[PDB]
């Protein structure tokens, strides 16, 4: 658990690396701030002029545990319990 | 469910807890229980005065006129609520019960007067 936790927390891609990789603006969308686009990171190099090809359906592997929760189907008497401050 | 005969009626369905009554106006079959199944809810009546000292009465006049045109009857307490509002005429016994109250109170004024006068 510890050897893997430190492993994934070190291989995480930041917002700045992502922009530099694809040369695009990283915009943050928040419900509390409405539709306002917040620029969190921009590429240092030449900003690309062409947009990313919009994908009709993404071929990304999902997790049944998350999909089952979003559909109001994961019943559990141990989830969302009132606990102390952490 | 299917009841032998019967008909639709616009009555009061008692609700609330002990010493706190709250009626809800509904259109239900005649044989159905008081607080049982109903066709539609057409208002509510709070007997107990509120902080402002006034009794609230909700009425879906647009729907009460629909069911009365479909063959629905009315209960006496509910016919006295529509007369107090101006939708129906004052029920005859709402008038006679007032006359009885007048004569009754005038009958008590005599004894009260005689006592203060004679004694």
């Amino acid at each position: 658990l510890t050897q893997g936790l430190f492993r994934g927390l070190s291989r995480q891609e930041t917002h700045q690396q992502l922009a530099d990789k694809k040369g695009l603006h990283v915009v943050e969308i928040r419900e509390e701030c409405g539709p306002l686009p917040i620029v969190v990171a921009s590429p240092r190099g030449p900003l690309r002029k062409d947009p990313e090809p919009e994908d009709e359906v993404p071929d990304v592997k999902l997790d049944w545990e998350d999909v089952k929760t979003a559909q109001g189907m994961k019943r559990s008497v141990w989830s969302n319990l009132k606990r102390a401050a952490t | 469910k299917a009841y032998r005969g019967g008909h639709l009626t616009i009555r009061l369905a008692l609700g609330g807890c002990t010493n706190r009554p709250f009626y809800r106006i509904v259109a239900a079959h005649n044989k159905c229980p008081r607080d049982g199944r109903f066709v539609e809810q057409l208002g509510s009546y709070d007997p107990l005065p509120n902080s402002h000292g006034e009794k609230l009465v909700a009425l879906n006049l647009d729907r009460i006129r629909h069911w009365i045109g479909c063959g629905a009857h009315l209960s006496k307490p509910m016919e006295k609520l529509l007369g107090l509002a101006g939708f129906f005429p004052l029920h005859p016994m709402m008038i006679t019960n007032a006359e009885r109250l007048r004569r009754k109170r005038a009958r008590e004024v005599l004894l009260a007067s005689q006592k203060t006068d004679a004694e």
């Binding site: 319990l81 606990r83 102390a84 | 005429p89 109170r105 008590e108 203060t116």
Partner: protein
């Protein structure tokens, strides 16, 4: 124990005895409940004080008698409200007893009613699409004829003395079961002097 800040509780949080004991952290930071298991009960103890007697491990509010839960002590009520969502934490989060968590929710709701505590107030839309008072419902209606002449809406609201020939029919119709004839009622309701 008589707290000197009973009338002015907001002066204890801005003193040096509070800073030497709590510092900059909330009063419930260094508090832990004693329960069996990893998952604690979903309710805290009803109260930490029973007939002027304190329990072994009092809550952050009952352990310090100088912390008074009042709607004026804004600086203490902010420690029990999230600074990012404006929601009051449940008791297991902080560890307070139900008696004091019921007093905090009131004081927090009473301070927001006096404008002492800041909370999110949304920008709602108007109730009505139009604002025209061109309707009888909100305006005057032509007084009906019977209302101008001081008459009832229907003629049969008033008492009408029936003929004598009709009463004899009733008397003959109900012979031996009768009641004294009642005359026209008074115009207005009597009253007890």
């Amino acid at each position: 124990p008589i707290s000197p800040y009973k009338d002015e509780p907001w002066k204890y949080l801005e003193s040096e005895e509070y800073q030497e004991r709590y510092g900059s952290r909330p009063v419930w930071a260094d508090y832990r409940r004693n329960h069996k298991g990893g998952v604690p009960p979903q309710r805290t103890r009803k109260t930490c004080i029973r007939r002027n007697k304190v329990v072994g491990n009092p809550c952050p509010i009952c352990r310090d008698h100088k912390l008074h839960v009042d709607f004026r002590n804004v600086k203490l009520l902010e420690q029990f409200v999230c600074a990012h969502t404006g929601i009051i934490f449940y008791a297991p989060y902080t560890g307070v007893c139900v008696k004091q968590h019921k007093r905090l929710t009131q004081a927090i709701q009473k301070a927001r009613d006096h404008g002492l505590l800041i909370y999110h107030i949304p920008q709602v839309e108007p109730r009505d699409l139009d604002f025209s008072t061109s309707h009888g419902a909100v305006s005057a209606t032509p007084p009906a004829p019977t209302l101008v002449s001081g008459d009832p809406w229907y003629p049969w609201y008033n008492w009408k003395q029936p003929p004598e020939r009709e009463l004899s029919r009733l008397r003959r119709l109900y012979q031996g079961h009768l009641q004294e004839e009642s005359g026209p009622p008074p115009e207005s309701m009597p009253k007890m002097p």
